[PDB]
Structure formats: structure tokens, C-alpha cells
RNA sequence: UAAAGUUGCUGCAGUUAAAAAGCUCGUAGUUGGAUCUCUCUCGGCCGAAGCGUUUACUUUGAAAAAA
């Protein structure tokens, strides 16, 4: 079930059994890598890059075409953000909640949701620090949550 | 013109290379076999009066070979009468590291060089045009396993004869019984 | 029941089931080539697209994102592949 | 969450056997699950089974002969010694005439009788009778 | 049937099935009877696969024939629709009929008036003949039932998928079961049509009789 | 059922359910022993021989006795394939 | 002390008999999904050589007062 909710949903992607590049896909691995570089230059996260490649250009899974993952490709060339996408989005949501709570001190549900979001941020930060993706001194602070981004 | 991996060319290996050296010129792929180099070639009996020929291609060129192998194979089967020709890559299996070891490999064994990954890649190269759409392993009462492979339904009647040689080649290379079928459901 | 053959289910039963609950899971989605009167080149559209795919050859949208399958535009012919 | 997938497999087999079904779908598959099933099959308790390969973690369809009274797991996997093996088969097996305790030892996964023959203790996985 | 051509289902049987409405089930489907239907119509009526009906009818005929003493087979019908069809059947095959109310204790109370010990049990409707079906679970009594799409299959060993609602269908099913039992036994032949007409087994409400005279 | 000398010491050998291969107890009064008459190949008449199926009371209670007998007959050549 | 499966690791109980915290987060703690098959010691079977990749486990072998 959900980490911070009582729900238990089954929604997710179902990858096909085949791992081969599709028949319709004529793009070479280098072509897809250049497309990924251009999309990242446009200012998109790996999730958005994969979504756009799947929707318009058409790739079942870029890992099957290029042999690498989107974040791995971006790091290989070097375009990845300092902090990972999920952690950045969690911090952005926390900043938005705190900004709302400044003018909505009566909102006792936003405070509860902010506690949940901060807990998720702390768990993710601990995991990423374990994997050396974050500095061992990296810390999430309310005074610096927006100030760092 | 071959570059044998074992440093020991054979008569049939040299013969296969000579047939390739020909194709290269009198053909439609002068712009192909040029670098498309092989490393070894074996001829094994698959059962009954038929046999088969397995061409061992180096890994980094396989894709290039796979671009034209279907065109190449069709000619070699012509050049060798009733003998099927199969391209599999020279994938090497590093032994599983043990606590009792030697200076076998100081670094971590890559997953591509494990036995299971190499065997699966061998099974995938054994059937290049037809794809693997499903795999099953039936563990029989005697503890003996049997691999059943589902192939593409569109290439059914063109490769159904290639059965009984794919199984033979797989049993020669990996030592596992395998069957190939084409289920009704896509 | 009590003797249902789980190794070889019918294709109708497999399609009826949830995509993740099948014997071997497969997506319900697909890719299509769409022909537009205002263009001629092939553009591949995912059936469940989340972005507004645009026609390169004109100023018309190709499909609109929906909760599920994308809403293909009128006059553009979609052909599913594979 | 899901821990010790062998417990899930054995519980699924036990439940399907109690209901009188002829086949059971075990998922996920695992090396320990397959070894336990092989040990159970060599004694005629479970019969044939087939591993469905999906590219993430296989499933197993197990044909069921109605010879199984109970297949269970022992959690945590206590490290049992040979001298302490007998006590275990007093606690888990119906009689001394039938029923097996499955151990995982340095020589592989096998029943208590084969562990005694090979002169090796190990860690108790489960039992079936 | 056993895939024998001699025991295969003939044209006239199919025509009688279609005339009587035997292929038409109800709007509800029991999950135990799902293997006997073919498709659900646009109006929600389930079509009963007539081939499966023939196979189950022949299996029931074999089960009845195996009972050496013909009287040891007991045929029950509490609904009026199957009363006369039962009474004819018992006369045609030698079975013992219970048409009307089944008094509880018939099978399990040794000290009783109509205490019988049948070796086989045949009923018209498991929903309407639930008392003999439940009682057969006390005396090791195997059961044969004429089951609709929504008929429960508890204590039913041979379920014959048929329309057991309409009088024409019930009468035809009982008549065909009697005919097949006779043909299997040896009496009457399968080469010439049976002299007994299916309408003999049909239930006739008093309104139709008052119309006839 | 046999001692070291190989003598059968059991009072009797109980029937096993034809479907579940489970022992039918001495007091399972809901269990049945169906006899299905065999039929000549050319005349379709009773040969005098039959085939017997023992069904336990639990399977009868669950309503799966009909499918059980049908499966046994199908696998036994009495009910035609499909 | 056993009886006491009335201290329950084996092996109890928690709807109504005694009992699940009002609810959620959260640290230590506990538990954590598939997956990897130039060592053989000197005179063309003969003394030397150790992070031989640590562990747990398990099976040997020594060393373990008598009463």
C-alpha cells in the first residue's frame, strides 16, 4: 500500500515481455541519445523526457534502444541536476505547502500533510546519502528548502 | 582471413571462411562482410541423417551480422545442401567466484558473463529472425528439466523445419533440452 | 472450477484479466501511425499519450490527453502496429 | 510487506491442497522455492510443476496430487545441528514412518534423512507430510 | 456418448429440442453450470449448449442403466410440471415415482410408512426438489438432476443442462431420458422411432383440458 | 500397512475419492459410488460391465461433484471429447 | 518443581469472558522481493610459500580437574 496513505492501488506500467526495439522504431541509439540531450537542454526531467519520447517520437522503452537509462545517459554526458528528480519534486511540494501555511495558519490539515511530505523527504535523503548520491552533510532545512532551489 | 579465438584453425573452419571470402566479392554485400569477421565454425549432427553448421561470431559485430545474416544464411544453406547455418556469438562464461579461489578474476564478474545470461543470449542468437515471446521450464518427475520456447506466430511455417536443429545446437552448446512451439494466443 | 488449467488459459480469459494479473503480463496499450490530411510523413502516437502530440506538417493537434486512451482527432486515420 | 516468499509458496500449496484443486499458481518463483518443490516431488508429494518465465520474477504452476497433508515453513530459519535434528522431527512430523523436514545445508537443500546420510546439519526451511 | 456414431445426437432430437425450448435457459447463471451454456442473448437469456445436454443425458442414462434393479431408481417431482412426466417414466423404465409432496424422513427414517432405499435419485428441479437431494446426502444416494442455468449443484452428481421450467421441455427431457434408458437396456431399438410420443410426458394444466372438451 | 515381514496388518483399505484422491471415511454417508454402464461400440447397448467412481461427501456438498463426474467420464472415454 | 498450553521459545490470549494505545508520523530495535554454474613445496608421486577475499552457519580436530 501507499507509504503515507491507507490506499492500495494496482495502477502502474506493464512492460511487455519482448525486450527488442520495435519494428516501427527506425531511430538509432545515437539518434535517441541526441534527442534526449536536446530535450534535457530544453529543461526536462528524465520522466518528462521518457514521456515525450514515448508519446510523439515513439519509443517503447529507451533502455531497450540505447541500452542505457535516461538519467544514466544524462550523467554520462553530464546534464543531471545536483539533486535527483524525485527529491527535488518532494522539496518543491514541501516549499509550496509551507508558503501556503504562512498565510493559512488555521489550516491544520496542511500541517499534517507537511509533516508527511517532510518525512518522505527525510527518508529519500537518507537513502540517497547512503548511495553517495548526496553529500554526507546534506540536510533539508525549512529555512533553506526554497533557498537551496 | 579469419581471426580464430583458440589460435588453432581447423579444416572446416578454414573452409567456411573461404566460402565467406567468396560471397564478399561475388555477391551484394561487398559493403558488408568486409569487417563482418567470424572466429570459429563447427559442424554437429542434430539427429538422424541431418547435420547443422554453427558459425561463431564475435559479440561486438553480431548486430551487423544480424542485419544481413538472414540474407547470408539463405545462401550458405544453398552452398551446403541440407545443412542449416546458425550464428551465435562467442560469449565467454566466467566461473562463479568462490571463497576457495585463485587469480582467476580480481574484479567483479559482470552479469553479461554469467552462465545464465550467456545461455539466454545464446538461445536468443540461435533464433534470430523469430523472436522469443515466452519461456517455460517444466521440471519433470525425475528432476530433469525441459525448456519450452514460444516463437513468433508470423514466422511459424518458415522456421518450423529449423526445429530439431535449434534444439540440437542448444543441447550441444549448453547441454539443456529445449523445445520450440508457436502458441495460438499472440 | 477445482480443475482449472492455469498453464493454458483461453485468450479471451487472458484479455479479460487485469494486465498485471495475467500469467505473463502485457500492456493493454499500443502504438499507432496517424495519417493527417495536412501532412504526409509518419508520426507514431502512443495510444495512452499524456502530451498534446502536434502535427509537424500543419497547425493541428494530433490527439488530446484523456484519463485513459488519448482522444485522436477527427480526419486523421490511426493504424495500430504489431 | 512480503518477506520469505517460500512461506507464501508453501501456504498457497497448502490452501490449494485443502480445497482439492489440481493445480496451484505460486508467485514469485525462487531458487529456494524450486529446490523445495524438487525435494517434495522426488518423494511423490507434489508431482510435476512448470516455471512460467516472465522477465521480472517467474511464476510456478504446480500440479497437485492429493497426497499432501500439510506443507509448512519454519521461520526463522534456525541453524539446526545433527545432534539436535531428532528433536525437530519429534515436533514437526506425524510419525517416524513418513514425513520429512527440509534443511538447507552446505551440500544443498535436502530432507532430514539425506542430511543424516550425508552427515551435515544446516538451517531448517520447512516440512511436508 | 463415447464419440460413437450410433449414440450421436440425431436431427429429429435437435428439432424436438428446439421446438420444446430446451436450449433456452434463464436470465441467471449458476457458476457450476457455466460450462453448459453457449452464449447469453441480447435480452439476457442464456442459451444452453444442446451437445452438452445430450452428453449429460446419455451419462445419466448410463448411470440409470447400471442400477440392476429398475425399481431401485427413484424419480421425484414436487412441481406439477414434472409430475406426469415422472409417472410415465416410472412406467416406461420400471423406476419408482414420487410425484407430489416429498415427506421428510422418506430416506432416513426406517420406522415410517413410505421408507424406501433407492440406489439412484432422479429429480426435476434441484431448487424445488431440495428435500430429496438433502436427504440423499444421508444414505449414500447418488443423484441425477435436470438443472437450469441458475440451478444449484449441491448434491447433484449428474446435472443435465436443460430448461426445466416449461412443461414441454420437462416432458421432452423425461421422455428422452426414458427412451435412452430403454435403448441402452435392450428393450426397443434405436433404428426405428419410438412408438411413445413426447406429448404423453407433457403436463397439461386444467385450463387446456377445459379448452379441449 | 505392512510389518517388517511384509504381512498386511490393516483392518481394511479405505476407498479414495476418485476426484481428490482423498480417503473416504467409514462414516461419510454423503459419499457415493456411481456406476456408469459401458456401451457396445456398434450397437450402443449395455455390455454388462460398468466403470465406478467414488465421490466424497465434501465434494458433493461443494457442488463440484457434477464437474468431477463429468471430468472422470471425459478422461475415461465415456463422454466424448468436447 | 511438575501438574501450569494459568507466563506460553516450543506454546496461550486480546469482538462480547481480563485485554488493541483516540489517530497518524517517526528514531533506536526487529524484519526485509527475483536474480550471478603463474597454490598444488629442491637431483626433469619427493622440506619451503598467505587478507590463501573478511564472516555467520554446519561438520571435523586439538584443549578442556576430580567428585
Curated annotation (Swiss-Prot), chain A:
<dbReference type="GO" id="GO:0032040">
    <property type="term" value="C:small-subunit processome"/>
</dbReference>
<keyword id="KW-0007">Acetylation</keyword>
<dbReference type="GO" id="GO:0070181">
    <property type="term" value="F:small ribosomal subunit rRNA binding"/>
</dbReference>
<dbReference type="GO" id="GO:0042274">
    <property type="term" value="P:ribosomal small subunit biogenesis"/>
</dbReference>
<dbReference type="GO" id="GO:0016020">
    <property type="term" value="C:membrane"/>
</dbReference>
<dbReference type="GO" id="GO:0022626">
    <property type="term" value="C:cytosolic ribosome"/>
</dbReference>
<feature type="modified residue" description="Phosphoserine">
    <location>
        <position position="29"/>
    </location>
</feature>
<dbReference type="Pfam" id="PF08069">
    <property type="entry name" value="Ribosomal_S13_N"/>
</dbReference>
<keyword id="KW-0832">Ubl conjugation</keyword>
<keyword id="KW-1017">Isopeptide bond</keyword>
<dbReference type="GO" id="GO:0002181">
    <property type="term" value="P:cytoplasmic translation"/>
</dbReference>
<dbReference type="InterPro" id="IPR023029">
    <property type="entry name" value="Ribosomal_uS15_arc_euk"/>
</dbReference>
From Swiss-Prot, chain D:
<dbReference type="GO" id="GO:0070062">
    <property type="term" value="C:extracellular exosome"/>
</dbReference>
<dbReference type="GO" id="GO:0005654">
    <property type="term" value="C:nucleoplasm"/>
</dbReference>
<dbReference type="GO" id="GO:0003735">
    <property type="term" value="F:structural constituent of ribosome"/>
</dbReference>
<dbReference type="InterPro" id="IPR047863">
    <property type="entry name" value="Ribosomal_uS8_CS"/>
</dbReference>
<keyword id="KW-0687">Ribonucleoprotein</keyword>
<dbReference type="GO" id="GO:0042274">
    <property type="term" value="P:ribosomal small subunit biogenesis"/>
</dbReference>
<protein>
    <recommendedName>
        <fullName>Small ribosomal subunit protein uS8</fullName>
    </recommendedName>
</protein>
<dbReference type="GO" id="GO:0045787">
    <property type="term" value="P:positive regulation of cell cycle"/>
</dbReference>
<keyword id="KW-1024">Diamond-Blackfan anemia</keyword>
<dbReference type="GO" id="GO:0005829">
    <property type="term" value="C:cytosol"/>
</dbReference>
<dbReference type="Pfam" id="PF00410">
    <property type="entry name" value="Ribosomal_S8"/>
</dbReference>
<dbReference type="GO" id="GO:0009615">
    <property type="term" value="P:response to virus"/>
</dbReference>
Curated annotation (Swiss-Prot), chain E:
<dbReference type="GO" id="GO:0005634">
    <property type="term" value="C:nucleus"/>
</dbReference>
<keyword id="KW-0225">Disease variant</keyword>
<comment type="similarity">
    <text>Belongs to the universal ribosomal protein uS2 family.</text>
</comment>
<dbReference type="GO" id="GO:0022627">
    <property type="term" value="C:cytosolic small ribosomal subunit"/>
</dbReference>
<comment type="function">
    <text>Required for the assembly and/or stability of the 40S ribosomal subunit. Required for the processing of the 20S rRNA-precursor to mature 18S rRNA in a late step of the maturation of 40S ribosomal subunits. Also functions as a cell surface receptor for laminin. Plays a role in cell adhesion to the basement membrane and in the consequent activation of signaling transduction pathways. May play a role in cell fate determination and tissue morphogenesis. Acts as a PPP1R16B-dependent substrate of PPP1CA.</text>
</comment>
<dbReference type="GO" id="GO:0001618">
    <property type="term" value="F:virus receptor activity"/>
</dbReference>
<dbReference type="GO" id="GO:0005654">
    <property type="term" value="C:nucleoplasm"/>
</dbReference>
<dbReference type="GO" id="GO:0043022">
    <property type="term" value="F:ribosome binding"/>
</dbReference>
<keyword id="KW-1183">Host cell receptor for virus entry</keyword>
<dbReference type="GO" id="GO:0005886">
    <property type="term" value="C:plasma membrane"/>
</dbReference>
<feature type="site" description="Cleavage; by ST3; site 2">
    <location>
        <begin position="132"/>
        <end position="133"/>
    </location>
</feature>
<dbReference type="GO" id="GO:0003723">
    <property type="term" value="F:RNA binding"/>
</dbReference>
UniProtKB/Swiss-Prot annotation, chain F:
<protein>
    <recommendedName>
        <fullName>Small ribosomal subunit protein eS21</fullName>
    </recommendedName>
</protein>
<dbReference type="InterPro" id="IPR001931">
    <property type="entry name" value="Ribosomal_eS21"/>
</dbReference>
<comment type="subunit">
    <text>Component of the 40S small ribosomal subunit.</text>
</comment>
<dbReference type="GO" id="GO:0006412">
    <property type="term" value="P:translation"/>
</dbReference>
<keyword id="KW-0689">Ribosomal protein</keyword>
<dbReference type="InterPro" id="IPR038579">
    <property type="entry name" value="Ribosomal_eS21_sf"/>
</dbReference>
<keyword id="KW-0007">Acetylation</keyword>
<keyword id="KW-0256">Endoplasmic reticulum</keyword>
<dbReference type="InterPro" id="IPR018279">
    <property type="entry name" value="Ribosomal_eS21_CS"/>
</dbReference>
<keyword id="KW-0832">Ubl conjugation</keyword>
<dbReference type="GO" id="GO:0000461">
    <property type="term" value="P:endonucleolytic cleavage to generate mature 3'-end of SSU-rRNA from (SSU-rRNA, 5.8S rRNA, LSU-rRNA)"/>
</dbReference>
<dbReference type="GO" id="GO:0015935">
    <property type="term" value="C:small ribosomal subunit"/>
</dbReference>
